[PDB]
Each structure stands twice: as C-alpha cells, then as structure tokens.
Write a protein that binds this ligand. Sequence first.
Ligand code: UP3
Lengths: 120, 119
Amino acid sequence: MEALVLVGHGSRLPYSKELLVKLAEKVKERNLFPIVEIGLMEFSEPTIPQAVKKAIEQGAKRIIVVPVFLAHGIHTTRDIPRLLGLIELEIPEDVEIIYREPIGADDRIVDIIIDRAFGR
Amino acid sequence: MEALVLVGHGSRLPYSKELLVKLAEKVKERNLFPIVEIGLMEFSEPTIPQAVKKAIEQGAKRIIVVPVFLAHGIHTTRDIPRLLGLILEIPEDVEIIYREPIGADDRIVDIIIDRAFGR
Ligand SMILES: O=C(O)CCC1=C(CC(=O)O)c2cc3[nH]c(cc4nc(cc5[nH]c(cc1n2)c(CC(=O)O)c5CCC(=O)O)C(CCC(=O)O)=C4CC(=O)O)c(CC(=O)O)c3CCC(=O)O
C-alpha cells in the first residue's frame, strides 16, 4: 500500500551502506511499514531507482522517501530529486513519491552528540 | 580545561554550516562544556584547524572532537584525522580526543520515523 525507502549517500567504503542496512532492519523491527527498502545514491547497490522499483513491485502506491542525510545539500536538493524524477526511472501514474526532509538539528542529535563526546 | 569541537562536512550550499551552528548553540544551552566550537572540513569557515586553535587559545588542553557525520568514511577515517594531526596544524602538550560518529543509533530511527510522517 505504502512503502518506506531510506536513502543514503553511499561511499566507496562499506560503512555508509552498513548504516542504512542497520537502520532499515531496526525500522522493520518496529512494525510500522508494509514495505521497507534502502537505496544508495552513489558507489553502491541498491541504487535509489532500484529501491523505488522493488518497492513498487511489492505493491506500494505511495512511496515515502526519507533522505538519511544530516543537512540539505546538492544531493538532497538536486541529485536525489532527479533520480526520483521529481525534477525534469518511470513512476507509474497510480504511484506517488513523497520526498521527506533530512535529519536536521534535531534535539536528539544534540543528545547523541553529547553521548559521543563522552565516548558512549 | 576541556573543549568540545563539533566538526562537520561543509558544503557549497549553506545548510551544512547552519546545521553545525544550530547544534553548537543547543549544546551551549545545556551548560555541559566550558568551550564549544565548530569547524567545517571543506568549503566553509571556521575550518577544523581554526576551531581547534580557538579552543586551545581559550584555555582548553583537552579537546573533544566529535565528527557530526552519520557514518565513517574517507573524511572521518583519513581527511579529518590528518587535519587533527592524528596521522597546517601544530598542537601543544594538549590532547585531542577524536570521538565516534553518530552511527545507527536508535534515536536516528526515531528521527527517521518522524520524518517519514512529515514531523
Ligand atoms: O570521498 C571520496 O573520495 C568518494 C565518496 C564521495 C564523493 C565522490 C568523490 O569525491 O569522488 C563525494 C563527493 C563529494 N561530496 C560532497 C559533499 C557532500 N558530501 C556529503 C557527505 C558525504 N560525502 C561522502 C563521500 C563522497 N562525497 C560521503 C561518504 C564517504 O565518506 O565516503 C558522505 C557521507 C558522510 C556522512 O555520512 O555524514 C555531504 C553531507 C550530507 C549530510 O550533511 O549528511 C555533502 C554536502 C553537500 O551535499 O553539499 C562533495 C562536496 C560538494 O561538492 O559540495 C563532494 C565533492 C568533494 C568530496 O569528496 O568531499
């Protein structure tokens, strides 16, 4: 019905993908979405288009795309909107992509940062 | 005595710096650190060396450097350790403590779920 697609930067190193995979598995452990997939913008598979099509094939008509990025940048403003076809890959007409906001300066980020500062 | 240095990627766009600024401000509001400074790896000021030097001159000898990055990558494993002189910059008898990134923290899941629902 509805799918969650977590999208991340990707890296020539393996850590960025590992992060998205672990995040997806935890979201799945929460039992909130019928369909959960990940896509990596560059260097690594699944790519963002592959994640969106896999989601569509599993039966999703509304696709929630969450940019797992701390801040807006060209990737969240230009490259990814592009891949998703939101700026001038095929999305069927009965399907809508809903592109969400990045993490930003969430109070919980401050909490994490302070934990890290103390080595926890 | 001890300083907190928040380090971020930087971007040709202003949003990456704005993020670090807001985060530093919120940490400052918590009255946890005597010295709090931000530095940006590229494209923007303060640079990482400038943040560390500011901290040192304000009286810090222990500099907690926290990479405000989601995952390790070449920047957290190579570029930043080198700016910190961990592998332009000359420190002192002072210790830099280079901390860990955010990683797949449960609170990241919480934020992601909020974002999924437009919150
Ligand atoms: O670094 C490499 O050599 C390969 C991977 C890589 C490249 C590709 C390459 O350079 O060949 C890539 C490219 C860059 N990404 C760049 C920027 C961004 N990378 C960003 C992030 C990353 N670039 C990370 C990695 C990459 N960024 C990687 C992964 C890695 O370390 O390999 C990350 C993710 C870091 C994280 O998880 O926070 C971010 C931040 C996203 C956020 O705020 O969450 C930005 C900010 C923006 O989009 O303007 C930019 C800067 C720019 O032109 O604006 C560029 C060109 C300069 C650079 O290598 O740093």
